[PDB]
mmCIF file of C-alpha atoms and ligand atoms in Angstrom:
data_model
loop_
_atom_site.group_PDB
_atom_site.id
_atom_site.type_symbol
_atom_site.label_atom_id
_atom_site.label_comp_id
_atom_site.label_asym_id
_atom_site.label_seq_id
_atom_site.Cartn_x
_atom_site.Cartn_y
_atom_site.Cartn_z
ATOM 1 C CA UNK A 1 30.270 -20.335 -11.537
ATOM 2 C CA UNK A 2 33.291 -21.186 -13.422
ATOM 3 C CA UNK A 3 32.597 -24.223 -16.074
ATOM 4 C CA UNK A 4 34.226 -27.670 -16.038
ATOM 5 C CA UNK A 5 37.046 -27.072 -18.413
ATOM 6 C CA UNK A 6 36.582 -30.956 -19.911
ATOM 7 C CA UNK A 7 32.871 -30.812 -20.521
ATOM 8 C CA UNK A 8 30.057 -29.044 -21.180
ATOM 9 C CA UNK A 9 27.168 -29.221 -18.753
ATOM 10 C CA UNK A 10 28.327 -28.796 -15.239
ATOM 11 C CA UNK A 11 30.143 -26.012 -13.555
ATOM 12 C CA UNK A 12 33.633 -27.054 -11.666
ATOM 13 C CA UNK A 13 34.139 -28.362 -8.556
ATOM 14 C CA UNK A 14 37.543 -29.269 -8.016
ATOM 15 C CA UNK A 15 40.872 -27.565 -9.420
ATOM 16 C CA UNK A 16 43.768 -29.717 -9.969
ATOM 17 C CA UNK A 17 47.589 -27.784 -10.292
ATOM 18 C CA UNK A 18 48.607 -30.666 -12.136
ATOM 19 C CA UNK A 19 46.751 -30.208 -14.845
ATOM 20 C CA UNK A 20 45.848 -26.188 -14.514
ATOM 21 C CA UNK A 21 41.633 -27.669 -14.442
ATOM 22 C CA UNK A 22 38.586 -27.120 -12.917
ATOM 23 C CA UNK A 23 36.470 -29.769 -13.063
ATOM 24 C CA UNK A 24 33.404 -31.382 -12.224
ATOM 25 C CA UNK A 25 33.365 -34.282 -9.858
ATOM 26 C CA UNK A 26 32.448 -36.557 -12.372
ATOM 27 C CA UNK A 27 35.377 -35.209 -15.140
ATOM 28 C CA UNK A 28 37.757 -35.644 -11.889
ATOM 29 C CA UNK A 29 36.837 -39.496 -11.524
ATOM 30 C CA UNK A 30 37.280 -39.497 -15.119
ATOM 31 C CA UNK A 31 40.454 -37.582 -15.333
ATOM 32 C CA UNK A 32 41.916 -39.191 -12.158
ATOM 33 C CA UNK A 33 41.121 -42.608 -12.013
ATOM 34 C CA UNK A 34 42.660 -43.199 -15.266
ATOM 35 C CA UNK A 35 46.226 -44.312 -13.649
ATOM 36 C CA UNK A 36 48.116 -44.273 -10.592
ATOM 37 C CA UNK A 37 50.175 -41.813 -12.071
ATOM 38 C CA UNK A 38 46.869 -39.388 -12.331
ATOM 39 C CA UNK A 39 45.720 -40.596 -8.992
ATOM 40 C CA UNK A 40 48.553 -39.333 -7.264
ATOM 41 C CA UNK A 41 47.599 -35.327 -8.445
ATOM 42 C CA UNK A 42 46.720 -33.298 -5.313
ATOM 43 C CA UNK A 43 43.262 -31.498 -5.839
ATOM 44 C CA UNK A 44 41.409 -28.745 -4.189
ATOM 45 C CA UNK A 45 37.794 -28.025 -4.100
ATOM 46 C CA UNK A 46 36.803 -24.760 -5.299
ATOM 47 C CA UNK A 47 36.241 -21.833 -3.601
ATOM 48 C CA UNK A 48 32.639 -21.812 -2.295
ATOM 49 C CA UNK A 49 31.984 -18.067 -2.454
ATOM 50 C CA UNK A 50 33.329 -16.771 -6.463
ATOM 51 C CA UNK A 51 33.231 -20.684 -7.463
ATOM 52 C CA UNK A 52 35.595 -19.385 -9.683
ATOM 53 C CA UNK A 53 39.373 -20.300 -7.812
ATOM 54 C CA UNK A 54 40.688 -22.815 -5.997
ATOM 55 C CA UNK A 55 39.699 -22.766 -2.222
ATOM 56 C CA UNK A 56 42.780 -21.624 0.476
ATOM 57 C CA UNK A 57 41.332 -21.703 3.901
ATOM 58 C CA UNK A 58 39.075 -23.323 5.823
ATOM 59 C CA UNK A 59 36.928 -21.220 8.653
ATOM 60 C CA UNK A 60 34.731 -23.002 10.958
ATOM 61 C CA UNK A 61 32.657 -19.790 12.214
ATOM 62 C CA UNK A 62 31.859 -19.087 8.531
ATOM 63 C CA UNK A 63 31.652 -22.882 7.667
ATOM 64 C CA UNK A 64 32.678 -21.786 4.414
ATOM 65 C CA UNK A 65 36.053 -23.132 2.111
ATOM 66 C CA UNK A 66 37.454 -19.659 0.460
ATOM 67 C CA UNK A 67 40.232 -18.595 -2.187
ATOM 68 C CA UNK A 68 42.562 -16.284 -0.624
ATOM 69 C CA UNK A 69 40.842 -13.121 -2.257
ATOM 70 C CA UNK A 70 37.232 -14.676 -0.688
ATOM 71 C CA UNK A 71 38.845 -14.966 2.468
ATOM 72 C CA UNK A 72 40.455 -11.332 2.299
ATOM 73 C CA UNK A 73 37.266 -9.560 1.413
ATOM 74 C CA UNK A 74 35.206 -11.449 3.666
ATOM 75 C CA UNK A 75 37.482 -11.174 6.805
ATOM 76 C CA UNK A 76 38.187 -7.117 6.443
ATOM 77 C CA UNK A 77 34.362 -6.259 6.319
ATOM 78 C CA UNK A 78 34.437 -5.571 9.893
ATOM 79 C CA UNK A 79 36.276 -6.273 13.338
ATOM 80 C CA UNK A 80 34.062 -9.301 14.415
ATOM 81 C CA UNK A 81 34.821 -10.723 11.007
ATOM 82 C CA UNK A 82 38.815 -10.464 11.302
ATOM 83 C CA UNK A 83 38.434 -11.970 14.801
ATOM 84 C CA UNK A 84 37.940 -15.797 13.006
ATOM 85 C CA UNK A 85 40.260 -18.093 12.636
ATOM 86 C CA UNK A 86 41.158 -20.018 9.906
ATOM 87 C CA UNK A 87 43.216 -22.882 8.920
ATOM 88 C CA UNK A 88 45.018 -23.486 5.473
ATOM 89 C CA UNK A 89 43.469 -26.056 3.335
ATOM 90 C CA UNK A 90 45.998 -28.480 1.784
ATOM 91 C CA UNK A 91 45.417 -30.661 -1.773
ATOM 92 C CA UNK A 92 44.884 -34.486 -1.362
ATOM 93 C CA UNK A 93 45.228 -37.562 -3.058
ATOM 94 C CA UNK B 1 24.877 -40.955 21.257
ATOM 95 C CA UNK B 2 25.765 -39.594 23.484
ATOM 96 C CA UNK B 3 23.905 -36.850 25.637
ATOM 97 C CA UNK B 4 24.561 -33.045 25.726
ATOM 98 C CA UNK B 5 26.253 -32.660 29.444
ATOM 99 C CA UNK B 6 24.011 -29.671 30.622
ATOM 100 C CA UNK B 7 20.383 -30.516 29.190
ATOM 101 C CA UNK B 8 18.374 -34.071 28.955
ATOM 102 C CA UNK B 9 16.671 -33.682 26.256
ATOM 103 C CA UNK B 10 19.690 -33.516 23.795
ATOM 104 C CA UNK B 11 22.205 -35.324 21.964
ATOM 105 C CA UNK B 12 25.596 -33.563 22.217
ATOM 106 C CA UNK B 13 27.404 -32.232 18.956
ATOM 107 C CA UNK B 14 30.763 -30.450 20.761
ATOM 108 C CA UNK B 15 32.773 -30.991 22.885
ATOM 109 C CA UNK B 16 34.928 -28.497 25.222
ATOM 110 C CA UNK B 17 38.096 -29.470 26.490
ATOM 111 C CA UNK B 18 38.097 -26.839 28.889
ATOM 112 C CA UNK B 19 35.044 -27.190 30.432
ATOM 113 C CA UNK B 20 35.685 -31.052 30.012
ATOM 114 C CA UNK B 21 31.668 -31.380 28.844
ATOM 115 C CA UNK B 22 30.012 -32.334 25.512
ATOM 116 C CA UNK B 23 27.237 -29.701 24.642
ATOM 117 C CA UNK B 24 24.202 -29.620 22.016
ATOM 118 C CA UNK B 25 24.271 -26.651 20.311
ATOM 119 C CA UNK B 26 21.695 -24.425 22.538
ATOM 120 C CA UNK B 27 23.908 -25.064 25.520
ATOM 121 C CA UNK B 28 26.914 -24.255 23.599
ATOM 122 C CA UNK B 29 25.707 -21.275 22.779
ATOM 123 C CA UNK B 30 24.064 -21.123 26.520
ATOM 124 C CA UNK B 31 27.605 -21.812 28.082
ATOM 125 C CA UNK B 32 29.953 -19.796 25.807
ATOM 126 C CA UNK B 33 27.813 -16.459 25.662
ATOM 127 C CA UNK B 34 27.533 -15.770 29.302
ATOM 128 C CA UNK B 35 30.830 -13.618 29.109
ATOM 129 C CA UNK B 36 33.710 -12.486 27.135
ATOM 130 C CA UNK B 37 35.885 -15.639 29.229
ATOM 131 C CA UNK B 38 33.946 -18.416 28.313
ATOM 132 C CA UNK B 39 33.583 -17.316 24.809
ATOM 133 C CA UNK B 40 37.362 -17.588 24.297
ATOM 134 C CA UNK B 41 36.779 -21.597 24.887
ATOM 135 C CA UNK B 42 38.160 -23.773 21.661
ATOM 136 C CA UNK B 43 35.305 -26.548 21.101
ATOM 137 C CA UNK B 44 35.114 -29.144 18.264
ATOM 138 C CA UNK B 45 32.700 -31.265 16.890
ATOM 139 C CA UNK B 46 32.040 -34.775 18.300
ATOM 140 C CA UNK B 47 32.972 -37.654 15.798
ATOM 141 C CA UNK B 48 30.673 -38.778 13.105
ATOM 142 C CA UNK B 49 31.311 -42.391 13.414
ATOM 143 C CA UNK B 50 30.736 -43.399 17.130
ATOM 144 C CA UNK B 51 28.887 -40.050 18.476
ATOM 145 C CA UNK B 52 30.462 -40.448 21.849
ATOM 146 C CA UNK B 53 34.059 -38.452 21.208
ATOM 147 C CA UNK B 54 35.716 -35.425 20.338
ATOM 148 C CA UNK B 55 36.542 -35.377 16.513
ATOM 149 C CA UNK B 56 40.056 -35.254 15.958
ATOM 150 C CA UNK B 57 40.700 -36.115 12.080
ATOM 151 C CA UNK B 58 39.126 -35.040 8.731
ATOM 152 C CA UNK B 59 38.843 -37.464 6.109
ATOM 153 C CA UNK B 60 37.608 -35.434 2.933
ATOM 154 C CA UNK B 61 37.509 -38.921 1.222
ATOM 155 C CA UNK B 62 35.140 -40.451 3.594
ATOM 156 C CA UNK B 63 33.610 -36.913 4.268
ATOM 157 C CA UNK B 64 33.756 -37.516 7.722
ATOM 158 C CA UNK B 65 35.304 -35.944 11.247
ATOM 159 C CA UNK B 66 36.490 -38.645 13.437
ATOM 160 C CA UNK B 67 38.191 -39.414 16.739
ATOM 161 C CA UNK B 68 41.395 -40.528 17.089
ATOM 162 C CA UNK B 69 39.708 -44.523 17.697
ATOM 163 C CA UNK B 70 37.286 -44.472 14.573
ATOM 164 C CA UNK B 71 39.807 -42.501 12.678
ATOM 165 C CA UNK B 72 42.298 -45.791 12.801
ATOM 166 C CA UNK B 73 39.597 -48.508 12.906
ATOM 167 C CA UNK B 74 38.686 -47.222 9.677
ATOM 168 C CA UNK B 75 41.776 -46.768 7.793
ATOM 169 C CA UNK B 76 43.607 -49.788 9.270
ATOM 170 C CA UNK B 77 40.602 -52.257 7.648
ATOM 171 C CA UNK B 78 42.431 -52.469 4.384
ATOM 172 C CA UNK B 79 45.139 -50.764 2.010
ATOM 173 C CA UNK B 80 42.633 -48.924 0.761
ATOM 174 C CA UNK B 81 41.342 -47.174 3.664
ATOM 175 C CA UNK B 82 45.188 -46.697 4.330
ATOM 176 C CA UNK B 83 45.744 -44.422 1.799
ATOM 177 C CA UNK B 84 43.077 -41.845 2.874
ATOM 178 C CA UNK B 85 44.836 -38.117 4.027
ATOM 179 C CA UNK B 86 43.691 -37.046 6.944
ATOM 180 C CA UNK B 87 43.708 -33.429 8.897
ATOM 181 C CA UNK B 88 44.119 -32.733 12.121
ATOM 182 C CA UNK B 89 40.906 -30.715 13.346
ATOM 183 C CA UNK B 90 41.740 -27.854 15.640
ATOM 184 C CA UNK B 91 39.075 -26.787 18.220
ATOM 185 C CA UNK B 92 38.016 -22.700 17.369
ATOM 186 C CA UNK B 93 36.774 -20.131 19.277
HETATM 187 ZN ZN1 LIG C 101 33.096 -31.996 -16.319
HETATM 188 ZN ZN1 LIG C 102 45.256 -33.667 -12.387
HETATM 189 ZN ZN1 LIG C 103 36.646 -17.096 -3.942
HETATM 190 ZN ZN1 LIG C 104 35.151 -16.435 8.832
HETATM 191 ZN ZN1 LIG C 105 22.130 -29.288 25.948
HETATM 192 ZN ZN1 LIG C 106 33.804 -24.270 27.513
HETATM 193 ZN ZN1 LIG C 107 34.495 -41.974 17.106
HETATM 194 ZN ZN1 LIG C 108 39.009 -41.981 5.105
#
């Protein structure tokens, strides 16, 4: 688990471009409720398999939110793994 | 909610377009596994609001999948349900 790159206790949660951070929930209501400005940077929960990267795509079967190197290695382990479908997750608010 | 199509005893958490039927789990996985045809069917889960209808939107702010009739009686009650970003949720499998 990556840290939060604004405090000390908790590991990330979200990755913001904007900024180049992972954070914490709590240092991205902090961070991002500061302004409008602020509140308009698109975020991205991280990945739920390194923790370390910002999640890419979304697969149902796995019910699992994966960077693109997450989703590579798991979808190439065998044929009934490459058979799922998944669907490119986009930053918000 | 409302009731799983193929068994009484259940509450239905998919629907199936192409077999026009909401299923509970068990008889999803009763319906779907019988051959290599019905397992290409694309289901989705029913909406977290009303329980009665296909999900059709994801609303990471309100953590929640809704159809297309809870999606905008919840983001039409005020400006700041407006602003939510939504996703369109694609049936799988
Ligand atoms: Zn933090
Ligand atoms: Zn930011
Ligand atoms: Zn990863
Ligand atoms: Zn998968
Ligand atoms: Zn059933
Ligand atoms: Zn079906
Ligand atoms: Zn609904
Ligand atoms: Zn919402």
């Amino acid at each position: 688990a990556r840290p939060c790159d604004t405090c000390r206790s908790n590991a990330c949660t979200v990755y913001c471009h904007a900024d180049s951070a992972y954070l914490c929930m709590s240092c991205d209501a902090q961070v991002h409720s500061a302004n409008r400005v602020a509140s308009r940077h698109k975020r991205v929960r991280v990945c739920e398999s390194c923790e370390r990267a910002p999640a890419a795509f979304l697969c149902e079967a796995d019910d699992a939110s994966l960077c693109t190197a997450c989703d590579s290695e798991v979808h190439s382990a065998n044929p009934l793994a490459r058979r799922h479908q998944r669907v490119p997750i986009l930053p918000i608010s």
